[PDB]
Design a protein around this ligand. Sequence first.
Ligand SMILES: CCCCCCCCCCCCCCCCCC(=O)OC[C@H](COP(=O)([O-])OCC(O)COP(=O)([O-])OC[C@@H](COC(=O)CCCCCCCCCCCCCCCCC)OC(=O)CCCCCCCCCCCCCCCCC)OC(=O)CCCCCCCCCCCCCCCCC
Ligand SMILES: CCCCCCCCCCCCCCCCCC(=O)OC[C@H](COP(=O)([O-])OCC(O)COP(=O)([O-])OC[C@@H](COC(=O)CCCCCCCCCCCCCCCCC)OC(=O)CCCCCCCCCCCCCCCCC)OC(=O)CCCCCCCCCCCCCCCCC
Ligand SMILES: CCCCCCCCCCCCCCCCCC(=O)OC[C@H](COP(=O)([O-])OCC(O)COP(=O)([O-])OC[C@@H](COC(=O)CCCCCCCCCCCCCCCCC)OC(=O)CCCCCCCCCCCCCCCCC)OC(=O)CCCCCCCCCCCCCCCCC
Ligand SMILES: CCCCCCCCCCCCCCCCC[C@@H](O)O[C@H](CO[C@H](O)CCCCCCCCCCCCCCC)COP(=O)(O)OCC[N+](C)(C)C
Ligand SMILES: CCCCCCCC/C=C\CCCCCCCC(=O)O[C@H](COC(=O)CCCCCCC/C=C/CCCCCCCC)COP(=O)(O)OCCN
Lengths: 459, 121, 347, 55, 140, 104, 53, 56, 69
Amino acid sequence: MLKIIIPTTMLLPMTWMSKHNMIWINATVHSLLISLISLSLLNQLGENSLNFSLTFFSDSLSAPLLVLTTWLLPLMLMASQSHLSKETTTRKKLYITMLILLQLFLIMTFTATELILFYILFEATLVPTLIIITRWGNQTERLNAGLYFLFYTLAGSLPLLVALVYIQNTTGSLNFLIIHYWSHPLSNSWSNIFMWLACIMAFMVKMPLYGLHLWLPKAHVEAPIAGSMVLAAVLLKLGGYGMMRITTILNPLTNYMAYPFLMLSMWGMIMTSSICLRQTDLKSLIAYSSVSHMALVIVAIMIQTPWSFMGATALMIAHGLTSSMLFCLANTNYERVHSRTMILARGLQTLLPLMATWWLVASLTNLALPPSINLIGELFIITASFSWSNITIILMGMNMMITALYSLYMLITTQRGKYTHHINNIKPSFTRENALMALHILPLLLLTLNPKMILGPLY
Amino acid sequence: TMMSGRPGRVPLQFLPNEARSLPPPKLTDPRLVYMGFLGYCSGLIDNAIRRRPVVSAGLHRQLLYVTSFVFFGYYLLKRQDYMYALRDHDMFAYVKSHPEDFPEKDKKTYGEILEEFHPVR
Amino acid sequence: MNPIIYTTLIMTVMSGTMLVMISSHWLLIWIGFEMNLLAMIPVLMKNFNPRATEAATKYFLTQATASMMLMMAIIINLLYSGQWTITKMFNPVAMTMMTMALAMKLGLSPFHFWVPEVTQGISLQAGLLLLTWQKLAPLSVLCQISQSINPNLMLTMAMLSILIGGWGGLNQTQLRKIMAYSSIAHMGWMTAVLPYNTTMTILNLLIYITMTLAMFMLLIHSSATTTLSLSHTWNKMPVITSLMMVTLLSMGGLPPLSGFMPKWMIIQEMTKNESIIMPTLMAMTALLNLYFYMRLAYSSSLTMFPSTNNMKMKWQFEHTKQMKLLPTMIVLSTLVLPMTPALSSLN
Amino acid sequence: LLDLIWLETILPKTTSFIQMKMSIMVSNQKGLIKLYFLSFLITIMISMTLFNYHE
Amino acid sequence: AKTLLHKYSDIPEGTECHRKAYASTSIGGATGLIVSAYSIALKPPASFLEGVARTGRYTFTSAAIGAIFGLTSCISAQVREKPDDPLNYFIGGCAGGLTLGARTRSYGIGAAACAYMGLTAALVKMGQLEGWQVFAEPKV
Amino acid sequence: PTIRLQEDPDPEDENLYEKNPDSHGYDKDPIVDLWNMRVVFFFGFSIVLVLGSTFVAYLPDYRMQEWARREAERLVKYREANGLPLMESNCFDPNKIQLPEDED
Amino acid sequence: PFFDVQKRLGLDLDRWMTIQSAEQPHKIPGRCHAFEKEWIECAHGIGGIRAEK
Amino acid sequence: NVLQIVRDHWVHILVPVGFVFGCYLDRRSDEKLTAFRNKSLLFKRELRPNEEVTWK
Amino acid sequence: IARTFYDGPEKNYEKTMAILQIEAEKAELRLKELEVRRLMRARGDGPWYQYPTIDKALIDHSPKTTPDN
Ligand SMILES: CCCCCCCCCCCCCCCCCC(=O)OC[C@H](COP(=O)([O-])OCC(O)COP(=O)([O-])OC[C@@H](COC(=O)CCCCCCCCCCCCCCCCC)OC(=O)CCCCCCCCCCCCCCCCC)OC(=O)CCCCCCCCCCCCCCCCC
Ligand SMILES: CCCCCCCCCCCCCCCCCC(=O)OC[C@H](COP(=O)([O-])OCC(O)COP(=O)([O-])OC[C@@H](COC(=O)CCCCCCCCCCCCCCCCC)OC(=O)CCCCCCCCCCCCCCCCC)OC(=O)CCCCCCCCCCCCCCCCC
Ligand SMILES: CCCCCCCCCCCCCCCCCC(=O)OC[C@H](COP(=O)([O-])OCC(O)COP(=O)([O-])OC[C@@H](COC(=O)CCCCCCCCCCCCCCCCC)OC(=O)CCCCCCCCCCCCCCCCC)OC(=O)CCCCCCCCCCCCCCCCC
Ligand SMILES: CCCCCCCCCCCCCCCCC[C@@H](O)O[C@H](CO[C@H](O)CCCCCCCCCCCCCCC)COP(=O)(O)OCC[N+](C)(C)C
Ligand SMILES: CCCCCCCC/C=C\CCCCCCCC(=O)O[C@H](COC(=O)CCCCCCC/C=C/CCCCCCCC)COP(=O)(O)OCCN
């Protein structure tokens, strides 16, 4: 599948060899072309994955994520070319280089057939995101945000490397096909328990889990718009993809060992949904909504049934798109008002009607409105959990209620009421922002037209 | 260090005559291409440090960088391949020389191997 | 100091370490160590000042004590077998003497105290020489007698070195002390895998030397020895700051950067033979080294510290003496991870 | 009570506090050769009567 | 030296609580003596009497930790009739941590010492059970 | 100086609509801004979106589901006509499975 | 580490003094010449690992 | 006027030629995995009277 | 679309068959190498892990100014 990797490594020097006022046009055009090309991996065999070579293969789980990343890059470029207008040419090229490198590492991550190569790229995605957050942020807390983002990930993912090298020393290989065909049960011993923990906690903190989620609000608030988009859309799904890949080796230990993680995920989903209600900031609310949705995905992966896996894949894609759109919508208001407080700018529907419509659509898709793919994933996960235990429906229904509550609360506070009477610099919406919103939202509806493309390999 | 001391090993050869029985790496080898790319990156960094036009300051210097990196990489790859071939040869000779330590075990089919089933529920 | 005298002293230092590395007699190894110390003492004192004098004094005292212990080890080993060849060294007490003497010469913990002080007391050139070249001979002797060496003693000092290097580096603001503590932490990693596989030791040595050379050469380019003095070079040479930030990330152990290769290979080699706890502890401790590298990077390039008015005059002048091997060292310090399998050419 | 106080206290703030304390404890040496040469002597006595005594 | 660890280990885990407590407190006293020696060497006490006071303080604290750990672990393993269980070592470790907190008179230090010493003692017990190695001999 | 820095004053926001009533919000130079809008629209809405959706809608049935339906139809027809059970509980032939000899 | 240039060039810089039964001046023998010679002959061939068993 | 337009838009071919090179490299990668071509128990089949390979 | 952009399923089938064979061979070779290394380091009779001894060519077989030795 080098026909997708090589064009990105050509996006790099093309960006570096462009004219001072033509970098954005070229980058956007060629990234959109690359996403169109990557749209060709959606043709998946029902039997087994597509194995292009010894190193790279594509599965029904990998293809939606690859398409999402390749589609994400142009939107990030469109959103970044507003606050970077005063930057010099070299720093603009460096920013685009960081974005392109992040896309390249993400593309190579979702298709690597060997677990150590997957780990290497999964961790190589840390350098560009960190540079972006700590170099092109806005407040003085971006340094602490970057430190938290780096160390929460690394302190949980270093044991994964030891676990993987030990696995290769014992079984003899780390290729995913060989791992899946030659898989054997894990006995009940302390050594195997710590093997479980080492294999799981890295992806758990990448989700993040409820107890290990402290880095996410800092990173998503203090990052620039492109950093927030890429963090909330694809960089969170690395943990889910990792657990869905690594869980095959773990059984039968996982049934016994998933009780604390399931409990944390459910209760913390409730807790973060409740936290979203009493939030004075606008980006923190979206960050905590991401935490709640990813906790639901964690439950789906942990109970480990085919319906749960399909729901997890659908929810991952839908949440990526919705969270990216919400972050862009918040960023437009932040650029108008130059503050992140929610109640500062009120009654924006009378001043920006089309943005009011975009806000309404994003909030509707955030609270799982039928028949959007958000609801498809959420409902499949809820059904799988109900089969797992009939009492989980209480927690799921409470989460749904609180999600609707805080989504409509944000929509009403930001859009309805009367204007603030003293903000007279709210200019009419540009064409760029409306185009970005439309390019975020139309794929969601087009996908709910044909939902079998994002239901994963268990379909 | 397992291979530091070996029978019939000239100390500072870096390429024993026994290594000429192996196929030399092709000149279009991807590792050689990466070595040339490393040379090009070093040349660009050299141009940047001296405050010169990065892309086109010195063409002869960049050419020398690339060719030096490729020249060293060829022999580095030759030695690496020789050492891996030597390792495999010694491994096979040892496993053949000691058959009792590497016995051929029975080949059961899954129809008679009993594996315990773990239901997911 | 006259240039001929300086170059002949440097050649005498290199001759001493080569005599250590090419000799099979224990006496010739001891002679090489003595020659190295004798010609190394004046190099530290090339720029005369009281700090350089006391740094040289501390270095001389430590090295003389280590040489005394080393020769006592040699004499005891001779006593219990009339052999001079550098070999197994079966005798346990003599082997303990040799291991401790070589640890004192290397700077391994708990003998690590001298390294930060001597590094701070000497110039950047002498610090570069001390931190890179002065590790070859003790490491060569350790590699030769590695089978004989006791694992418990070696492992305990390596872990202590990693821990103390990280904790000490967490505090310092001076760049030379940071480099010294990083050197101690890296010595811990290299001596950790020594009983299991010396090829990994040699590979880690090569990469550490490359990274330290690049870092010192960049520090010499932007003549700063403190954090605040390094915080100005973004206003004069931004490319130097960017390269330094990338090199500092590489030193941290992050992937896809090259620095990660020695750490990954050492963990993999130690795992092959049922050592699981130790690699986990070493990685979680190297997180501290990464932290203070990252703090330096925040101070250096990822932010913009306030500058001074006189920098406008420096804007008009170019760096006269240019280091020829800096770009190659930077490239080998960062972009050489994909060529990992070439480590087989080291055994 | 949970996010801004206790979840911060347990994992990140405890780690920062412990590493700060250990960095301070390690990195306060007056620079007098007498003290750490005495420490070298203690290390020598320990090593010889804790490692090689059992073989 | 390691003979002290032999003294502690040669005793069956859920028997002879007094002897096991004596072995553990001897190990603790040795560790405290070593720590005090290093502390005096690196941070001089400015007088002989204060140095003796610091040595006694460190040694007594460490011996108390060892005695409490050994006694509590042995008693908990004996009353529960279930040896080879890391919970006993966890309880002993938390008892030692509470002893440390009482000695230094710090509630937070006491709680942290409970948690961390209990965890590390539990992992030591699991390593004893499964045969983990810290300083593994080279096997390859 | 009762201050601490020789610092530039904080610049005020630059409105793109002041010097360009029809801005599109991409750039300051009108021509490159208009062309950036045009390429974004043509390659996002025209090329990638519509053509990509109509390409995905017409992907060949490589998932083997119409094939699976035809297989099921023929097998149901054959099995029901013969009087055989519609589905068999044992996925594999018991003759080819060698269970352990005894359980005592 | 051990760059054996004596073996490559055939120089014998310091190998004449390593052992006790190697060409002493005036053919004066060491006190344990026979024992060391016996150990060396048996020892040289197999390698270090087999030489201790 | 080919001069200015070419010297300003020569960068608009890097991505297409990269795509073509990627396709060519994928074909070469396929060419080294032909160890079981027309040898799988499921798709084993006699050749046509004119063809020589089942797939490339 | 299937004629222009894709190939038949047999190509993917046989490609993954070859890939599986290669990976299985590599796994078996890695395990065999680990076992061989363990045995050769334990025993010391293998070509690998040979530790240098004293050359017998250094001994002087000449009359030694005293009859016995
Ligand atoms: C995996 C796939 C491949 C990826 C590998 C990695 C990337 C490639 C290898 C990297 C090494 C190569 C280049 C590095 C040295 C370049 C030095 C430099 O600064 O560049 C400036 C230079 C612009 O300078 P200028 O044009 O002379 O005039 C403006 C002045 O220089 C005015 O300059 P100024 O000094 O006034 O500007 C100030 C600026 C100056 O500071 C800088 O510009 C930063 C320099 C970059 C750091 C070098 C790191 C060393 C390599 C390690 C890479 C790590 C990779 C791992 C991933 C993690 C990334 C950190 O400082 C700042 O703005 C401070 C902001 C702080 C940001 C922190 C980020 C720094 C680290 C970023 C590293 C990213 C990777 C390198 C990507 C390429 C960057 C050039 O850029 C270039 O024009 C050359 C770039 C490369 C040209 C490629 C062309 C290839 C051939 C063309 C045709 C293509 C094929 C045709 C055939 C088609 C068939 C028919
Ligand atoms: C093959 C390799 C092996 C190599 C080793 C071979 C060794 C064997 C042969 C050695 C023969 C000795 C020949 C000449 C030696 C040269 C001495 C010298 O030059 O003195 C310079 C040195 C500096 O003199 P200065 O600075 O000019 O004058 C300072 C003023 O006089 C007064 O200054 P200040 O009052 O202003 O300052 C307060 C005072 C501070 O003094 C204190 O605070 C004393 C505190 C000690 C704690 C007392 C024990 C309480 C509990 C004991 C528990 C026992 C176990 C029972 C179970 C538990 C019950 C609780 O002084 C200090 O700050 C310095 C502390 C040094 C204390 C003694 C150093 C011994 C080693 C370091 C460890 C310290 C002991 C800690 C506890 C260890 C376990 C007992 O003099 C001293 O440090 C003090 C006098 C030393 C005289 C005795 C030296 C002989 C012992 C050498 C150690 C070797 C071990 C002995 C045999 C071990 C068995 C194998
Ligand atoms: C993962 C998801 C999210 C997780 C995150 C959220 C959860 C985790 C974080 C929250 C938990 C952390 C709290 C742990 C200790 C932190 C306290 C601290 O910072 O110390 C420094 C802090 C201040 O430092 P300082 O400067 O040295 O002292 C100045 C004070 O202001 C001067 O104060 P004062 O002198 O004026 O008066 C204080 C004094 C006087 O006392 C008082 O003033 C009030 C009384 C408070 C403590 C007395 C105990 C009676 C209350 C306990 C009731 C049962 C608890 C719940 C169980 C329900 C059973 C169904 O207190 C005492 O003397 C008590 C000494 C020891 C008694 C503690 C034993 C009870 C433990 C509970 C056992 C439960 C077993 C499991 C059952 C559940 C499963 C079925 O010390 C304190 O002031 C508070 C210490 C007492 C609080 C005890 C609370 C413990 C709660 C349970 C612990 C189990 C969780 C941890 C597992 C591992 C531990 C074994
Ligand atoms: C903020 C959130 C961060 C992430 C949280 C991750 C949670 C990880 C916790 C791991 C869950 C279970 C671990 C071990 C499995 C069983 C635990 C125990 O309750 O089971 C009993 C075990 O008895 C004792 O309880 C043993 C455990 C006691 C010592 C462990 C310390 C637990 C105290 C809490 C420490 C804090 C953990 C989190 C650190 C931050 C049953 O006895 P038995 O069936 O015979 O033995 C089971 C194990 N066998 C089968 C392999 C032999
Ligand atoms: C954001 C911060 C998150 C921090 C998460 C960190 C915790 C990760 C879980 C433990 C990681 C280390 C486990 C080791 C990796 C696998 C190695 C393995 O499987 O081998 C085991 C070895 O297992 C171990 O050695 C485990 C020792 C653990 C030492 C370090 C403990 C770290 C902290 C423990 C508690 C953490 C777990 C829960 C933490 C939750 C998050 C707070 C079996 O040994 P064998 O050689 O095969 O011999 C058996 C046959 N005779």
